[PDB]
Amino acid sequence: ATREDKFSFGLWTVGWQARDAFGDATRTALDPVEAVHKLAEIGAYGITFHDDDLVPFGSDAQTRDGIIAGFKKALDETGLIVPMVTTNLFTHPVFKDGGFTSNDRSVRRYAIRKVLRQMDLGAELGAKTLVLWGGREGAEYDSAKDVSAALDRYREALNLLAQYSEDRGYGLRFAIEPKPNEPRGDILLPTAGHAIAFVQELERPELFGINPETGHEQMSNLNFTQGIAQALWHKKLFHIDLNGQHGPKFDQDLVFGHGDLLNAFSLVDLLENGPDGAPAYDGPRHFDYKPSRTEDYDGVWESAKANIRMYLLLKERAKAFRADPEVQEALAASKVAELKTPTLNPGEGYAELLADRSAFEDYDADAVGAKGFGFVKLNQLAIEHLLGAR
Amino acid sequence: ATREDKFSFGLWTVGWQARDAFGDATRTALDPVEAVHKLAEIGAYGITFHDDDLVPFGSDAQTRDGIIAGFKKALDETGLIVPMVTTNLFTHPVFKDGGFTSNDRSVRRYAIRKVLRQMDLGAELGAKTLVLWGGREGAEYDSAKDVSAALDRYREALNLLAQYSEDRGYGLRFAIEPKPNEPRGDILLPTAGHAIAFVQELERPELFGINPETGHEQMSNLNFTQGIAQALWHKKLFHIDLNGQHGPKFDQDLVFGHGDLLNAFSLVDLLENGPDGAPAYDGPRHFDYKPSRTEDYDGVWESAKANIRMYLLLKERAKAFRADPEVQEALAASKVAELKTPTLNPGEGYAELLADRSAFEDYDADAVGAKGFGFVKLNQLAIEHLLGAR
Amino acid sequence: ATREDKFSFGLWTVGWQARDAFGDATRTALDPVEAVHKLAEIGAYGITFHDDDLVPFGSDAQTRDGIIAGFKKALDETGLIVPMVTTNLFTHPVFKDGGFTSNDRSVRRYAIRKVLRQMDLGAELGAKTLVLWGGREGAEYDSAKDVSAALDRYREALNLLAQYSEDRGYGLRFAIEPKPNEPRGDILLPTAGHAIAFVQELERPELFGINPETGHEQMSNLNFTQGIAQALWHKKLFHIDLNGQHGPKFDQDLVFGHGDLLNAFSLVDLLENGPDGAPAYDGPRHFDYKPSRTEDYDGVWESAKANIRMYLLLKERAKAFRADPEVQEALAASKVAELKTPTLNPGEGYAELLADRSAFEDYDADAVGAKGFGFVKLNQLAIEHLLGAR
Amino acid sequence: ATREDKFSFGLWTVGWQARDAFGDATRTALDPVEAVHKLAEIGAYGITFHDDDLVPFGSDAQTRDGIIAGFKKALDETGLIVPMVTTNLFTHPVFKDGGFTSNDRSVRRYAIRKVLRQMDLGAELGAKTLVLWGGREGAEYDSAKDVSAALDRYREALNLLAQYSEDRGYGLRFAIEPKPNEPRGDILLPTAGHAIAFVQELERPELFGINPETGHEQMSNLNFTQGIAQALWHKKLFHIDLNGQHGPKFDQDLVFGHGDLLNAFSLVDLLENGPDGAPAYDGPRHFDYKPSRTEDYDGVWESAKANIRMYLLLKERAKAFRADPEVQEALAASKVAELKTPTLNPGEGYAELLADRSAFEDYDADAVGAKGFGFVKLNQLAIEHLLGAR
């Protein structure tokens, strides 16, 4: 693990005290400064936090100020950077119906102020990305929330934030994080797709992208790799949260690759074996996971390293997969690269196509319909590389 | 049922022979002229079809020609219109890896030709919408499909169709139909969101929208009404396919309202209790369902009528819900309408918001967080309206 | 709502303060005597609780005794009974790996002790059923739990509890409550089926049954009504927890009928329209739900009453359904009752079946296969009864 | 793969012509004798079949007789055996509402005769297991099927079959195969648990067990390895069907290990690293899968071989896993084996347990509650073994 690997961890990840919906915390609170030292140590290049993770909701400026100074010291000494910050718009009871989209007008005004403030701190620490997780934006009942009005209000708030950042010269990028449910019955912008469509409607869309999370897409049983590929095609992959999940159930937040292992592999392959050797993605490889409730601080550090471990083992196998002449031969036989050739010849339009008898009148669909694509075999070669059997 | 209600059915719904993945057909073939006659009789205002549902794959021109004239005569006599047409790019073995996105370049070329042909016929019959269902676009294995190249090719093909329509003066609108899976392990553009985001990237986006299907969103456990609300917000709801489903499992295609009843109710409320007093959506209410395999032709006509009956029954209760004073009161208590009031006062920006001590510095979040929204009570009044209990 | 309806509620239901996985409690603590009062007022005939709901974990004998006496007075004054009691084996950190099947043997012994104590209290308050919810029984990782050993230890603990109850003459019945996941990644005895199979291997199986909960089976997308019909077939429906859920996602605990309305309808029909006119189930109709986090104490009593109103409105429609002559006619056409007639004639065995040419050699499968069952029409009539449209 | 590996395939697997719910077959039919030869050649020890796979539905006795004789010769010459047989009670239209549980009495009678006839052929080919897949036993609508009457009729048919077998001295064991849905909306006996609980109610339970299939339990998002563990505890694992699936969606029938890889790994560990060095299960390792629709006959044989490769690679990794002193040390730290030690001391009863102050009075819940189990670390070593990183 090198700083060039860009592994980052949220302070709320290793810091999770393990108080779930059904029981009390099983671990004590982790000191930010300590987190900073431990992460530095296991090989992370950066740390992220929610305003309320570092400074307890409601601290006076004196306390608030003190905490920041100490945190700043720790980054200093260790060389860790803060690539991204986020705001907590979900924990306090006032946000029970959302921040930006709460039906109560006062709550919406307050939620914007809370974020502007976090934007200030972010800028001060050199953060380039503001992640927005609208965990409480949504509903349990259909008649309780006007989605249209809600989207108008989500948009109004975001447009203000971009206005401010651009005026203060912060140069932040905004990353909307999709989640289908939990804690609300249904959350607005439920998938990477919905989040991308929404961003295209903002005032300065170029400043906005998405921060998709492994488990979030898997909670709806979607293919995370395929969703990232789409995000990459759109050029809206501004950040990414890696973790593990076992399908449609509560959000598990397991270590990266401890859930759908086969998808974890295709994912590393997509991010790393980009066009011309180079990665297809350049930002932080952020782990937004939780050390299982059954573990102690020993278990905590273990799990932090397991994340890095899993990513580096998969990368290694994805590289070997692509480099294998037999895979290279199977890729050819399956015509994977033929999808890159335009369907139409150069300068060809409808008329030329309509005049080409070979594309219709004289085409033998039955004969082409019978040739196999060799996909099972290519798939089997991939898994054998994953398994270290090749 | 009135023509003003705009209920339409696909030829392939009532005409489905009930040959499933595990058994033979239990019903004989339905004659198209017959279908037009029976549908006219139950109150449908229009009929739709895939090319291959009307004219059997590979019919010579004489044959094809003959079928169309008979069909147009039936239309004529009954007063039924053809609001939308679509193309079968999924049945024939040549389409096993997709039509527009098949790895094989020749299939992609053939796929476009098959659609242009269907476009002409739709144009000829007065159809206004071309529905595109990319059922074979996707994969079973991640290494088999280059998603980026696939999107490029899906885009390449649609740009061409719009070019053609526009040059010819056809005036067609194009509606992409999302589905998460089945027949492919994962289909490209899996949710309403992914499809909207994609469309925003074509050459003439104003010409493209979506055709979301109740059951397809429910196969991922998404809130159908909430995704339609988002589609309407983007102004991309070009068509809608109504049916029923029981969560994530194979596509059931039940009668509209026979799966998630509460969501069927909230959907009808959304489409009908629109902006003025007026519907929020003005297109065809299309039923894309299948009469259960256990039914004979009496069952088929019963199921067609059930679709219209479910809609009209829900419409009537949605209307009553909104007209109830007790509901008005509950809506007031839950602050539904307050979401429609901008968060900011007219002419207020971040400078004015930052200057407002009451939006943050003097804001009593604890007090606000203690008041209830009364959402359960609102939901209970809605359900009682649904049950005719009020 | 009469006391004969036998609506009961857990203290933890209306007492949920709404501290979820992602946020703080939105409501203050509810006083138990008050709860007894409030529930008696809305129509409940009994109240239930976990040891720890009534007496704070780590209460001195004096305090504990103090609480109980006040609680009994309240029941006294109100006329409410305690039909069932349960034990909390999921909250305290020591149970992080389970109670009865913790890998740690000291935890198992402690868990048993904790239950015996509740049995005593239960026996003393007149409870008839001990519900066992193994929420911490399971694992996040396959190699961490020997399922066979865990089943042995689960059995070993239950055998003892039955032994004790029988010897102290408590007359308790034990109801195992299945849940597929949450809080453990995977819980042991995930469905009503697994729980029944397990019970059958105990020493005095006649003393054990299950307590299935609507939401738990729906978390796996199973048909709750159908599972309950299987439970009744086996005679293992010792208790039932009613609530609502929107498929595979976190456990929602909505008001009964606020999730899958169609299945809530069919369930009420099955429990009430039992053979010989009479209900097929005579135990408590217990609501194990949670007033939404967006609600205050008024929303809380509103939600309690909604559970009762939903059950009674559905009951009324299930009876009207069964009483409708047209329904009677559709049931006959669907041959619902013909399934009750044995396949074999009295005294026929394989020898006589083999001799019947009409059951095989001369059977016309094709003519039988062509006749429809009229199921769609029958379903349509059920729904129309549910909507009060008939 | 040796014959000792006992890998078997259904004739219907490699012989699936790939006609799905949305398209035509992509492959021509496979001759059963050719399938026998090909299978033997890749290392299979046995072949299985549904009556209708070998002998076309409605074949005259001369035709049927010829097929069987040719079949037997191939078996002879290759040395392959027939370990299990099954009956098709799902394809023909007559079975649209089920076989044994159809509402129509005559269908129930014919279903039993179809099965008796297959039992004869089975017994003559030396099969020891009869698998029962009730694919059509269920409903799309709740009111269409009396479940209780259905279970009565199911049991009635099964008792007769056991009777006939016992009387003819066939010595067959019966394995019910659970499936949650598809082709019916909901299938009776939906999970391995439901089928086990049902079997326990038959006249001769000892002759009955289950045939669970990987994808089927994953269709409900259940832990397959954990449910197999429970089946082994009950001693009802009479047979097993191995394949791949991606959570809740249509039945994919991918090659074993191509779905949930991590669960495939823990499944192979459970079966082979049984108690006493030896496998915990000794029946056939049957592959009930389908070669993807995109493949030709080369892809079909490649996929048959992929199943066996998949199983042997995971077996090798499972073995190394367990022989690793670091893994053993982690197991000890996680206390996995301590679950195998009774909770109660020998001769200890409730009286003695009540007497141990160390189990309650003097129990430090708080101190125990703070020790970590090291489960993450153990999971990490398990995956490093699978990855061949160790």
Dihedral angle, C-alpha D168, D171, D177, D178, nearest 10 °:
90
In degrees, rounded to 5, the angle at the alpha carbon of residue D323 between the alpha carbons of residues D322 and D325 is 100
| C-alpha dihedral, A32 to A38 to A42 to A48, nearest 10° | 0
The answer to whether B376 contacts chain A (CB < 8 Å) is yes
- Cβ contacts of residue D24 below 8 Å, gap of 6+? B91, B92, B93
**A20: chain C residues, CB-CB within 8 Å:** 21, 183
Which neighbouring-strand residues pair with A10?
A48
Gap between the Cα atoms of D386 and D390, Å rounded: 8
Residues β-bridged to residue A85: A130
Measured distance CA(B202)–CA(C361) in Å, rounded: 63
Spatial CA neighbour of B103 closest among B138, B61, B76: B138
3-class state of residue A275 by DSSP: coil
- Tell me the two tokens of residue D226: 């954990």
Q: Which residues of B are annotated as a binding site for Mg(2+)?
A: 177, 213, 216, 241, 251, 253, 288
H-helix segments, A1-146: 11-14, 32-42, 51-54, 61-78, 105-124
Say which residues have a Cβ less than 8 Å from residue A65's Cβ, sequence separation at least 6: none
3-state secondary structure of C12: helix
For testing the chain B interface, which of D17, D96, D137 should be mutated: the one with the most B CBs within 10 Å? D96
How would DSSP label each residue in C188-220?
SS-SHHHHHHHHTTSSSGGGEEE--BHHHHHTT
Tell the residue number behind the tokens 């859920």, with chain if given: C245
Q: Which residues of D290-310 are buried (b: 16+ CB within 10 A; e: fewer)?
A: bbbbbbbbebbbbbbbbbbbb
Provide the residue type at C259 as one letter.
Answer: G
CA D94 to CA B25: how far, in whole Å? 11
**In this structure, which amino acid lies at residue B381?**
L
CA D17 to centroid of chain Cα atoms: 23
Q: Do D374 and A306 touch (CB under 8 A)?
A: no
Place of tokens 């930010």: A32
Identity of the residue in B246, B372, B388 whose CB atom sits nearest the CB atom of C298: B372
Residue C154 CA to residue C148 CA, distance in Å, equals 10
Q: Are B334 and B279 in contact (CB under 8 A)?
A: no
Question: Which positions in chain C touch A24 (Cβ < 8 Å)?
Answer: 91-93
D146: Cβ contacts below 8 Å, ≥ 6 apart:
C336, C337, C339, C340
| Token duo for residue B213 | 């299907």
Give me B216's structure tokens. Answer: 């397809």
The alpha-carbon gap from B220 to the nearest alpha carbon of chain D, in Å, equals: 9
Question: Which residues of chain A form beta strands (DSSP E)?
Answer: 7-10, 46-48, 84-86, 129-133, 138-139, 173-177, 186-187, 208-210, 241-242, 285-287
β-partners of residue B241 are B213, B286
Of B249, B383, B389, which has the smallest distance from its Cβ to C221's Cβ?
B249
Closest Cβ opposite residue A23 in set C20, C91, C251: C91
Residues 6+ apart with CB under 8 A from A17: A25, A26, A27, A28, A29
Of B157, D352, C140, D264, which is closest to residue A293 (Cα–Cα)?
Answer: C140
Quick one: A134 exposed, middle or buried, by C-beta within 10 A (0-12, 13-18, 19+)? buried
Element (H, E) at C120: helix C105-125
**Any idea what DSSP says for residue C358?**
G
Contact predicate A115/A156, CB 8 Å: no
What is the 3 state secondary structure string of chain B? Answer: CCHHHCEEEEHHHHCCCCCECCECCCCCCCCHHHHHHHHHHHCCCEEECEHHHHCCCCCCHHHHHHHHHHHHHHHHHHCCECCEEECCCCCCHHHCCCCCCCCCHHHHHHHHHHHHHHHHHHHHHCCCEEEEECCCCEECCHHHCCHHHHHHHHHHHHHHHHHHHHHHCCCCEEEEECCCCCCCCEECCCCHHHHHHHHCCCCCHHHEEECCEHHHHHCCCCCHHHHHHHHHHHCCECCCEECECCCCCCCCCECCCCCCHHHHHHHHHHHHCCCCCCCCCCCCEEECCCCCCCCCHHHHHHHHHHHHHHHHHHHHHHHHHHHCHHHHHHHHHHCCHHHHCCCCCCCCCHHHHHCCHHHCCCCCHHHHCCCCCCHHHHHHHHHHHHCCCC
For the four alpha carbons of B295, B296, B299 and B301, in that order, the dihedral sign comes to positive
Contact A14, A30 (CB under 8 A): yes
Say if C375 is an interface residue toward chain B (CB within 8 Å). Answer: yes
**Structural contact between residues D134 and D157, judged by C-beta atoms closer than 8 angstroms:** no
* Per-position DSSP letters for C307-328, written without gaps between them: HHHHHHHHHHHHHHHHH-HHHH
D132 min Cα distance to partner chain C (Å): 18
Residue B356 corresponds to which tokens in the numbers above? 């407002």
CA distances from C203 to C163, C169, C199 (A): 9, 17, 9
Residue B46: φ, ψ to 5°? -155, 160
> Tokens 């289908």 appear where?
A180
Residue in this structure with the two tokens 């996602």, named with its chain if needed: C249
Describe the crossing of helices D192-199 and D147-168 by its angle, rounded to 10 degrees: 60
Q: Are strands A138-139 and A84-86 parallel, antiparallel or unpaired?
A: unpaired
Q: How far apart are alpha carbons D294 and B185 in whole angstroms?
A: 12
Whether D383 and A264 have beta carbons less than 8 Å apart is answered as no
Q: Give yes or no for D135 touching B (CB within 8 A).
A: yes
Question: What's the order of all strands across the beta sheet hosting A129-133?
Answer: A84-86, A129-133, A173-177, A208-210
Q: Taking each helix axis from N to C terminus, what angle separates C224-234 and D147-168, rounded to the nearest 10 degrees? A: 60
The number of helix segments (H) and strand segments (E) in chain D equals 15, 10
Among the listed residues A149, A158, A224, the one whose alpha carbon sits nearest the alpha carbon of residue A192: A224
Does the beta-carbon distance from B227 to A341 stay under 8 Å? Answer: no
Q: Which of A249, A258, A376 sits opposite D302 (nearest CB)?
A: A376
Chain C residues within 8 A of B384 when measuring between CB atoms: 309, 313
Q: Answer yes or no: is D352 a known binding residue.
A: no
Nearest to A258 among D296, D313, D379 (CB): D379
Contact C112, C95 (CB under 8 A): no
The DSSP 8-state label assigned to residue C54 in this structure reads H
User: Pairing state of beta strands B186-187 and B138-139?
Assistant: antiparallel
* Catalytic site includes residue D37: no
CA neighbor of D145 nearest in space, from C335, C227, B291: C335
Question: Could you tell me what percentage of chain C is helix, strand and coil, using 3-state DSSP and rounding each to the nearest 5?
Answer: 50, 10, 40
CB A315 within 8 A of CB A266: no
The nearest CA of chain C is from the CA of B215 a distance in Å of 14
Number of domains in chain B: 1
Q: Is A92 within 8 Å of chain C by CB?
A: yes
Residue D174 in contact with residue D158, Cβ under 8 Å?
yes
- In chain A, residues with a C-beta closer than 8 Å to the C-beta of B339 are 101, 103, 145-146, 149-150, 153
Asked if A158 and A208 count as a contact pair (C-beta separation under 8 A), the reply is yes
Alpha-carbon dihedral angle through residues B97, B99, B104, B106, given to the nearest 10 degrees: 150
Partner residues linked to D156 by β-bridges: none
Distance between C197 CA and the closest CA of chain D, angstroms:
4
CATH number at residue B43: 3.20.20.150
Assigned token pair, D30: 């496979």
Closest residue of chain B to C390, computed from CA coordinates: B388
Neighbours of chain C (3+ CB pairs under 8 A): A, B, D
Residue B174 CA to residue B162 CA, distance in Å, equals 8
In which element (H, E) is residue D328 found?
Answer: helix D325-334
Task: Determine the residue of chain A that is closest to B371 in CA distance.
Answer: A94
Q: Report the C-alpha gap between C294 and B374 in whole angstroms.
A: 7
Beta strands in chain C (DSSP E): 7-10, 46-48, 84-86, 129-133, 138-139, 173-177, 186-187, 208-210, 241-242, 285-287
φ and ψ at A173, to 5 degrees? -115, 145
How far apart are alpha carbons B14 and B8 in whole angstroms?
A: 12
d(CA B230, CA B209): 12
CB of C245 within 8 A of CB of C259?
A: yes
CB B193 within 8 A of CB A190: yes
Three-point CA angle C70, C71, C76, nearest 5°: 95
- For residue D11 the two structure tokens come to 């004739």
Question: Three-state DSSP class for A130?
Answer: strand
b/e burial code for range C263-288 (CB count within 10 A of at least 16 → b)? bbbbbbbbbbbeeeeeebbebbbbbb
Q: From residue C352, how far is each of A46, B83, D87, D106, D159 by CA, in Å? A: 79, 60, 21, 15, 15
Answer whether C23 sits within 8 Å of A96, measured CB to CB: yes
Distance CA D167, CA D171 (A): 9
Cα(B153)–Cα(B189) distance, integer angstroms: 13
Q: Which alpha helices (DSSP H) does A169-207 contain, by range?
A: 192-199
What is the rounded distance in angstroms from the CA atom of residue A283 to the CA atom of residue C331?
Answer: 63
Q: How far apart are CA D266 and CA D315, in angstroms?
A: 10
Q: Are strands D138-139 and D186-187 parallel, antiparallel or unpaired?
A: antiparallel
Rg (CA), chain C: 23
Cross-chain residue pair C106–D229, CB shorter than 8 Å: no
Q: Across chain A, how many H-helices and E-strands are there? A: 15, 10
User: Measured between CA atoms, how close is B353 to chain D, in angstroms?
Assistant: 47
C292 touches chain A (CB under 8 A): yes
Rounded to whole angstroms, the Cα distance separating C47 from C35 reads 9
Task: Report the gap between the CA of A21 and the closest CA in chain C (Å).
Answer: 5
- Helices C105-125/C61-78 angle, 10° precision: 40
Interface probe with D: pick from C107, C226, C377, most Cβ of D within 10 Å: C226
Determined by X-ray
Q: Is A4 helix (H, G, I), strand (E, B) or coil?
A: helix
**Token pair in block for residue B166:** 């526009």
Residue with tokens 């009677």: C328
Candidates C50, C239, C258, C385; catalytic one: C50
CA distance A321 to B248: 33
Is C83 in contact with C125 (CB distance < 8 Å)?
A: no
Which segments of A are annotated as binding site?
A: 177, 213, 216, 241, 251, 253, 288
Report yes or no: A365 at the D interface, CB cutoff 8 Å: no
CB contact under 8 A, B292 and C248: no
Query: Mapping DSSP to helix (H, G, I), strand (E, B) and coil, where does residue D272 land?
Result: helix
∠ CA A193-A197-A202, nearest 5°, is: 145
Residue with tokens 């973790």: A243
Q: CA torsion D145→D148→D152→D157, rounded to 10°?
A: 40
Domain encompassing residue A6: 1-390
Please tell me which chains touch B, using 3 or more CB pairs under 8 Å as the contact test.
A, C, D
Closest residue on chain B to C307 (Cα): B380
How far from each other are the two terminal CA atoms of chain A, in whole angstroms? 24
The alpha carbon of D329 is separated from its chain's Cα centroid by a whole number of angstroms, namely: 33
Cα separation, B36 vs B47, in Å, equals 7
Q: Beta-strand (E) ranges in A291-351?
A: none
* Rounded-to-integer distance, Cα D76 and Cα D87, Å: 23
Which chain B positions have a beta carbon within 8 Å of D246's beta carbon?
A: 185-186
Q: What sign does the dihedral C112-C118-C123-C129 (CA atoms) show?
A: negative
Query: Å from D347 to nearest chain C CA?
Result: 12
Q: Are C178 and C216 in contact (CB under 8 A)?
A: yes
Resolution of the PDB structure in angstroms = 2.4
| A75's tokens | 């980054």
Q: Residue C355, exposed/middle/buried by CB under 10 A (0-12, 13-18, 19+)?
A: exposed
Residues composing chain B: 390
List the structure tokens of B143: 């290494």
Residue type, A170: Y
DSSP state of A88: -
CB contact under 8 A, A389 and D389: no
